[PDB]
Design a protein around this ligand. Structure first.
Ligand SMILES: *[B-](O)(O)[C@H](Cc1ccc(Cl)cc1)NC(C)=O
Lengths: 131, 10, 95
């Protein structure tokens, strides 16, 4: 995020980090329950990647984070890689996340929910802060 | 869901 | 990329209004947000775009794509969860 700010640690409990076996963060995701993570289809997640929950500072060695293995990748069959439409993939954890103060689920809306133009929302992540 | 134990501050 | 988790508030736009920036690349399963002095960027992909609805944070978008330069004056494009939630519900039910 360019021009964002540091979050209050643990305040966005559903935020997870997708890391490859190298330990490199390549994408974010959101826990919707203890066994499923929603992420973007273009992230190209494989079962060799790891879901990291309860993390704030990727440089700290003393945070009690949960490194969860992925059992299966569910790429929306309607995802069009040429237009990046329907960019969503579900990840089923081989090991269920343990919910706590710093790890929990975000809510999903109803297909008929309305989010009006002008509404202020929040986006989170560990992406580049300057390009 | 959606109600964090540690309130975010913006 | 930053070691610590970042956050940013940003407004949602309408698709008709977003097409002014991205033209026809804006499809129905997409929702635009930003162009407010902030911007999602590389490494943010897949993460959440949440809005408070009746007291709880709900998943409105998934960080998808945007300007190759993360321009804070161009809107970012997110997958619209309201158009994809029926598939999510079907997938969780079958597995
Ligand atoms: B993801 O690959 O990290 C990244 C996310 C993104 C979203 C909005 C903006 Cl303005 C730039 C980047 N997208 C890509 C495909 O690199």
């Amino acid at each position: 995020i360019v021009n964002g700010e540091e979050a209050v640690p643990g305040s966005w409990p559903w935020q997870v980090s997708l890391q490859d076996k190298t330990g490199f963060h390549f994408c974010g995701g959101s826990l919707i329950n203890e066994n499923w993570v929603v992420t973007a289809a273009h992230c190209g997640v494989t079962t060799s990647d790891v879901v990291v929950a309860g993390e704030f500072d990727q440089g700290s060695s003393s945070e009690k984070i949960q490194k969860l293995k992925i059992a299966k990748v569910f790429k929306n069959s309607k995802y069009n890689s040429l237009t990046i439409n329907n960019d969503i993939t579900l990840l089923k954890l081989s090991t269920a996340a343990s919910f706590s103060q710093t790890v929990s689920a975000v809510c999903l809306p109803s297909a008929s929910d309305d989010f009006a133009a002008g509404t202020t929302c929040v986006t989170t992540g560990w992406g580049l802060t300057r390009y | 869901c959606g109600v964090p134990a540690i309130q975010p501050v913006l | 990329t930053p070691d610590r988790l970042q956050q940013a508030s940003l407004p949602l736009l309408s698709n008709t209004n977003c097409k002014k920036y991205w033209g026809t690349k804006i499809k129905d399963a997409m929702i635009c947000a930003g162009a407010s002095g902030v911007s999602s960027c590389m490494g943010d992909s897949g993460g959440p775009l949440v809005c408070k609805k009746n007291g709880a944070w709900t998943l409105v978008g998934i960080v998808s794509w945007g300007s190759s330069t993360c321009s804070t004056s161009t809107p970012g494009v997110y997958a619209r969860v309201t158009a994809l939630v029926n598939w999510v519900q079907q997938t969780l039910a079958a597995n």
